[PDB]
Amino acid sequence: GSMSLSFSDPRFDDVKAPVDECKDKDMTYAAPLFVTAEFINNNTGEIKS
Amino acid sequence: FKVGDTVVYPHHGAALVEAIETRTIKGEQKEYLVLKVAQGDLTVRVPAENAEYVGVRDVVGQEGLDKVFQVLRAPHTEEPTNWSRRYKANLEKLASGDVNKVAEVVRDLWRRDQERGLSAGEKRMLAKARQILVGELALAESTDDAKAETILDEVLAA
Amino acid sequence: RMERVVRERMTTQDVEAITPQTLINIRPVVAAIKEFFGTSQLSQFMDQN
């Protein structure tokens, strides 16, 4: 109970490629996920966002 | 501490404070300071009370330059014969974050590899420590990383 | 799975040196999503006659 991590606030970017290009070049039509992680030390006291 | 001071923080080098935060916890208004670096793009909030405990430092002085220069020009340095003990030792030197210890590490590693070349693990050992040391001097004398690379190479040959 | 790995590494990792970049392993999430969309009973080729 000295260190805590809370990944929070899910966020989405723009699709890496349009549909037809993905279907032609065999790419999976996806988009990245970005999440604000936060690490906190209890004893000294910080947040690492 | 004031706003705008280019303050140094281990292991992440120098950083810019952005404001003195009054973010309360448990009804007690700690004077946090938000402090961001350029490499990791992360912002760190530290109380000014234990700021020296966590170890927010200021830029190394000019005499520090000639100090680690004397350490880098220091002769007589030898190491344990078994390279495993040697490595773990200078790995702890780099991990300690002590500029002096780090300097010993890089200089002796290069003294070994300038002789006959060394292992890829030791090459990466040299590379990381050289990068962080070059950054440190390039913000200490504001000499720039490329120029700090050139001067680090200058002083290795002696 | 990510949480398990994160906490194991956190315990092994030294304090005052680590960050969520050094804690989070994103292999498990990618592996799970891949094994779902591909290689699953409930993700079928769209029958489009």
Q: Do A46 and B43 touch (CB under 8 A)?
A: no
List Cα–Cα distances, B20 to A47, B55, B121, C8, C12, in angstroms: 15, 17, 42, 34, 33
**CA-CA-CA-CA dihedral for B26, B11, B82, C9, to nearest 10:** 40
Chain C residues in contact with B40 by the CB 8 A cut-off are 19, 21
List Cα–Cα distances, B120 to B109, B117, B123, B124, C25, in angstroms: 12, 9, 5, 6, 25
The structure was resolved to a resolution in Å of 3.6
SS3 state of residue B25: strand
Helices (H), chain B: 51-54, 62-72, 83-95, 99-116, 120-140, 145-157
Shortest CA distance to A41 belongs to which of B36, B44, B18?
B44
Are B71 and B103 contacting, i.e. CB atoms less than 8 angstroms apart? Answer: yes
Q: Please spell the DSSP secondary structure of chain A, one letter per residue.
A: --EEE--EEEEE---SS-HHHHHHTT------EEEE--EEETTTTEEE-
What distance in Å separates the CA atoms of residue B65 and residue B142, rounded to the nearest whole number? 12
Chain C residues in contact with B54 by the CB 8 A cut-off are 16
Interface of B with C in 4-23 (CB under 8 A): 11
Chain B residues in contact with A49 by the CB 8 A cut-off are 42-43
Are B43 and B32 contacting, i.e. CB atoms less than 8 angstroms apart? Answer: no
Structure tokens at A2: 């000295």
DSSP, res C16: T
Structure-determination technique: cryo-EM
Paired with A8 in beta bridges are A36
Neighbours of chain B (3+ CB pairs under 8 A): A, C
Are B7 and B25 contacting, i.e. CB atoms less than 8 angstroms apart? Answer: no
Where do we find the tokens 């448990």?
B26
Chain C residues in contact with B42 by the CB 8 A cut-off are 19
Interface size B-C, in CB pairs within 8 Å, comes to 7
Nearest CA distance, A39 vs chain C (angstrom): 6
Shortest CA distance to B119 belongs to which of B87, B153, B71?
B87
